[PDB]
Assembly symmetry: D2
Homo-oligomer: 498 residues x 4
């Protein structure tokens, strides 16, 4: 308490006088220009909103801990995964297509973005609730996400646009099958699995390399909603998943996931019968079994959602020694894209915000810019220098690299022995799903096609028969009878759509 305090301050720390009445010429007069508290508070209010993420705008998260309980030191030198290591984490969950205020229970992919605050930097494993994705080249991703959003004239989501894109990009079949199956509607974020999806590189202390897949298996199980249930919840509680996570942690019910990897020897990655660098493919667990690493626990809610969750900036470029990227084109595009988006969304100094700062000392050659909170004093701005300010200069092949040879080209990845666009989707439908799941799948896909322009429907019938002839005919028969479920979040047809 200062001597002239009034209960709150302006931005300069001086007493504000009133948070409730403007400065006027008498009670009945106009507001004067020099009501600086009115101006400061309104100008700030007008700058509170920041661009929402594209994609994955709607989401929430929590802090936790990861504990290593197995010895995988023969596979990586990364500090975070050494025996017995416990690391603080942050996890943000999200949908993909919907905007900031959109219902949580729309049918969609869910994000699973996990940061480990390691002793050698922030390691981000930016995953999804599926082991695969719709595409295998990042040039197509902009198109895909735009097709999942809104028509340019009416501003409506449109299943015709969605199916036009999917049927003209048959590489999408594996993930469209997974999305249209049970797991398209998680009951809660606690009751879904997380995956890295991509192949990553692990490098051990001797320089030996393995290609790895990450799998986070929920200790709460996998539980899903029906289309009808999810539609009902979208109306009753648009923030159902956000509320569930916060309430669960507040009550002491800390959700857990066990991490397993698959580890492929370096040379076998080049010869395996499915392309491990193709994001539309899973790798068989009969060929490369899951190996346990440790357990993730979420146990602490945010104190401020905007500062800790909305302003968090995750990136697959945030690797640490012992972990690298891979020849997966999609992953390589992601190495550029996230940081770029965050410079616009948050700001140049996004990585100086507390939630994005690493625990270890940063000594980075970047200076100045807007909103530079932690300046470098008189440190040298160039290298080499004669002033004792260190720099890096390792020469030669990098520890997390690989070989390439060819001419500059734009073409599809070469096919391995068993690669195609529809086989793995067919295995999912025929061998993994139960009879009841298959029945529900038909009703979901048929519903998703209701009202779709007939030319696009016809292409969808061929697409589904390519996945499985029996399921495809069942879908076609139901579409021709105009049957099927309503799908939460999207429809087709009418004068405002294609």
């Amino acid at each position: 308490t200062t001597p002239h305090a009034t209960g709150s301050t302006r931005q300069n720390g001086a007493p504000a006088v009133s948070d409730r009445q403007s400065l006027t010429v008498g009670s009945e007069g106009p507001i004067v220009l020099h009501d600086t508290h009115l101006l400061e508070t309104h100008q700030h209010f007008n700058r509170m909103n920041i661009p929402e993420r594209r994609p994955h705008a709607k989401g929430s998260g929590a802090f936790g801990e990861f504990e290593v309980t197995e010895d995988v030191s023969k596979y990586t030198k990364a500090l975070v995964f050494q025996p017995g290591t416990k690391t603080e984490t942050l996890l943000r969950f999200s949908t993909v297509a919907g905007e900031l205020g959109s219902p949580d229970t729309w049918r969609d992919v869910r994000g699973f973005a996990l940061r480990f605050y390691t002793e050698e930097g922030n390691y981000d494993l930016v995953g999804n609730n599926t082991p695969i994705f719709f595409l295998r080249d990042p040039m197509k991703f902009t198109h895909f996400i735009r097709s999942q959003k809104r028509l340019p004239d009416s501003g409506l989501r449109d299943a015709t646009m969605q199916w036009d894109f999917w049927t003209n990009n048959p590489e999408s079949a594996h993930q469209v099958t997974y999305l249209m199956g049970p797991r398209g509607l998680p009951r809660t974020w606690r009751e879904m699995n997380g995956y890295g999806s991509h192949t990553y590189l692990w490098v051990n202390a001797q320089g030996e390399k393995h290609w790895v897949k990450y799998h986070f298996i929920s200790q709460q199980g996998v539980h899903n909603l029906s289309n009808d249930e999810a539609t009902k919840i979208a109306g009753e509680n648009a923030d159902f998943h956000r509320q569930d996570l916060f309430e669960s942690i507040a009550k002491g019910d800390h959700p857990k996931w066990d991490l397993y990897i698959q580890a492929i020897p370096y040379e076998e990655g080049k010869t395996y019968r499915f392309n491990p660098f193709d994001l539309t493919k899973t790798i068989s667990q009969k060929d490369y079994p899951r190996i346990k690493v440790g357990t993730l626990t979420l146990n602490r809610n945010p104190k401020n959602h905007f500062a800790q969750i909305e302003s968090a900036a995750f990136s697959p470029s945030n690797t640490v020694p012992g972990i690298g990227l891979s020849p997966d084109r999609m992953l390589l595009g992601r190495a550029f894209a996230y940081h770029d988006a965050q410079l616009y969304r948050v700001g140049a100094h996004v990585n100086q915000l507390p939630v994005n700062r690493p625990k270890n000392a940063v000594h980075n050659y970047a200076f100045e810019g807007q909103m530079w909170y932690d300046h470098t004093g008189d440190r040298s701005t160039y290298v080499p220098n004669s002033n004792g300010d260190s720099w890096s200069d390792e020469t030669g092949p990098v520890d997390d690299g690989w070989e390439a040879d060819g001419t500059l080209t734009r073409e599809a990845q070469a096919l391995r022995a068993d690669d195609d666009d529809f086989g793995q989707a067919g295995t999912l439908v025929r061998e993994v799903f139960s009879d009841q799941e298959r029945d529900d799948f038909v009703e979901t896909v048929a519903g998703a096609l209701k009202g779709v322009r007939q030319d696009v429907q016809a292409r969808a019938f061929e697409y589904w028969k390519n996945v499985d002839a029996t399921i495809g005919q069942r879908i076609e028969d139901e579409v021709k009878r105009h049957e099927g479920d309503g799908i939460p979040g999207v429809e087709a047809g009418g004068e405002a759509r294609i």
Copy 2:
């Protein structure tokens, strides 16, 4: 078609080569840094989103025409309202609290933002679907909107926060009554009325002044949804109102509103028994009857929702000769706030975008800045100048002014004879509502209070009894029995709320 065309271009107009595959070192190699088409398209994608409006993020609109059919020339010299004049319009409708992807059918105020493209500039009448508002001083508005949005930790909307603000700001009673009544849930935007809410100033050719209220009465009638219906629609079709407007216009069903004004002689504005400069008050139609002006028709959908609707920038500062502001503190704060927000949301040159440009010639002393599309060539940048580049220099009292006298103060407006916080709300509940509307009102208010922290509930019981003793007791009795409707868009209680 250029000789080396490929089907699309980069931003410089050169052939893009592929919109589907990235540039790699052989089919199996990494993406190269110099895939400039990948970079341009991803960097643009990452900058597509702009901050959503605060408030009124969720909305849509259409173009139309306004036709003057009466002679109100004795009241204003504004060109747009002279006899027989037809003017092109743009109208954006919206909710208030929810974000970009939020359901259209939440209980809320609706915006009614109307632009007239006049021969003497763009005239914006930025109204709502209610003649009043919650507050009478703009210092409180930031607080109010934050209370209608989300809790800082959990990110959830919370009825306890909403009622804590309303009960501690009893000036809100008139509009809270209107919001909790039938009109809180319009069936469609076509089936709601629009209002200017504020008193504005009209000035005629002789300089005579009248205080005016604007009323847009729907030719489609006023039709509303129940809480249960609106909740159901929120789940089934989050864009119901947006879809309805677009489809209606596309089918040729052009919605209309008739404009009426109330006209108060200048001196009577200072003595009237309710304060016309208090936005929480209506002016009796027995004292000042409605006078017809003309008819608004909406008849054309946008070609591009983002460019024409999302990027539209409406402002009450966009007056034209013959129409001015008034001593209403809320209006005077709005004269500053919109343009300020738009400089951040869209950009410095927001008013050069086609939808925001006026039809008449702009000759304005503003130069340079980012994204300056229509430059001024070698025009003088200062005034007076000796180069023949004109400027304005009218001296003396302005035609759209008024008098003031007093000392600089922060205090409430003085009360007129019949001014108070609860009387007009009481008239609405007792005399305007039917028995069925009163019954529904009790169920709505009781529902809105379910789960609210008990101290805040107790203050709400006193608030409602101040409006009407009978309705207040009915609400209290239902709250104590834990009865009432679910309210679309909000709830209270639980570990994630207050």
Copy 3:
């Protein structure tokens, strides 16, 4: 040192590997897209620059201390000026017209921007090296600064534009005289005086008010350069003043200024023979003598020029209890303008950067926005609230206010008994300047008019004769003979100018 350290890190804290070579496919191959260190460092480099200040882009500063050595407690309750108080300060000096890289020794006004880090907030006294300014209404300021900058087509500064503006705004005469006199070219910033220029309000503990002027009198004296010397230095050392200040402090030569005020009783401000609210007027020291307050010492250089000086954000709105604004229209426009500019130049959270943070606790109703470093946790976002988070609600006349009465108008300030545009300038030329200063003045003004378009020259001859008939004829005679000094920073004439 982490186990895999290389000498520097990326932004996530992981080893950077090399600050000297890019990631390529072999030594001879292309750079890959996933060189994340190349991308991070280049994207940051590309965002290092921020908009320069407009005006006052070119400048530098230092930290120091202010010590009160007199008792002025009968005049103000402000903590910073109570007996014996010592306060940390920051001072930025600058020119006005030139851009970031422009020479320090151009003829121009110099800024004198002083921050006191008080126990009741940051108090900014944003002054200049002159007691007056060119204008008395802020509407003209945009025009004035544009006239001092560059022609729209050629990008050159132009004396014709400068004189066209000055001669058509005769209120400028007092300050143009001061600028064209000796003090237009300070030798160093240490050897110039500083002034608040405007009348400010001081309020004591009993609520009694005085109008005050601030004067900072250099203990190093006032020393100036000739036009020829300053031109020579502009070529030899464009950063002469910046270098001088830094070197002087580094050598232990701490420059000092003594602060004096003039104190006008509240009622006398309304009746005084020169308008104290007209920024083009000085107040006679025979009528209101200077009263000593204390001494300012600069004694510490910045550690980082960009973070501490370039990113500093000074504003006349940063008052503290005991000190207020005044009816000076120019000051009232400044209360809005600085904070507005800083939101664009630096960012919404400009006042959270260390150099802009106050020493006392900030409790302000502003939340969210880009780059929010110091979040508010779960503090209530609205007022009043029932959660114990305080707010301000003082009602009634403010302690730093005054009275007004009238109709809304756009017109010049009424003239006091002795007010005019040329009298004070004439006193300066006839009574204050020495013979040698008058001789130099003629050569400066004549030089400044060389090459100016003849119609504008003719108006300038009348302007100068209005100041003083003898000096005006001397200037005219020299201009007609094409004599006069070269003026550092500007010229006229030729095919690229008016």
Copy 4:
């Protein structure tokens, strides 16, 4: 003229009333918040400045025409270079290190940025006034430019920092020699040559490839200033070069350059004795002679410097069919960097501003974003689509590609037979310079080393002896006697520098 016009408008097109007086409560009262014209004009003024370019902030330009007068169709299919073709151009000249207001005649590299508005897109040849550059890997460029700018604490340029960087990066020797020679100080931009510097790829109609160098040889000759002359001009006219170009064109004196190429057969680029992909190397004209293409004429000044020159956005990524990049690492980094910078400096839609738009039709998959002036209507946002909106999908090796093979590495380029860091610099000093140029060179280099920290001086003596033993000893002898010229724009020594 509208009926109520006053001489100028607000941004909405309504009469502004006054560009000279603010809206107040009586003549003596405060400014009201609702002076919307004051607010609009000041908010715009506060947003006029945009970040200056980094590097090359200080510059100007003109429009012209390029005319092909020879037949080089066997070497390229690019439309702009086909026989007889005339193309509109824009050329911006600049320095490198100094900021927006810095003198034109500092010793520095000059930029030569040329746009051709071709029928197949905007082709930008972003060159300099030297055939080489200081570095051969873009990772070092950020460091280099920071070393040429200012010290972090004092804000001064410092020759010690400059020489510390150069001597620790000996690849710089060739260009440092050129900079310190006669051509470091062009008399005018009309009297300097322009170069592409890098090797580019040309592809003919049959797909045959040649590596090319571009040389623009001034028809006005090469003329330079001494250090002393340039220092004098920096003080007298900081905009000498800008003024010269504008005045010359205005008087009808249109400067010309003849374009010549060197053409290296594709396979010879891999075996040549100097690395054509190393930007620090020239290619001998005895081995690959210059071949004339045509003539560039500048003949039209800008109408608005800010809109046409400051807001121009040039990029080496703006290739057209027939012209590609090359394996030069520096060029490949530039393909990313310019567009990235321009998104921050100007905006997402930088390429929709008139000066940046191509002449041919743009059909690009980019939508939305701030300040989207030319929208795409209802065009499909995804590909392939079934709506007739075209896209590109060429598969296989690109016409402007090449081969690569290797492992991911960070290392220096392999040396060709005659590659080293000092040989070409030595040829310049011994064989190209005259005796008088050598004498002046010694005085320039010695002057540039005056005051430099002794350890860095000692390294510079070794550096220069590596260039040439005789010149190096001459420089050392002069430095030890503290002799040498003052260098315009930079110095060393003293308490404010290293």
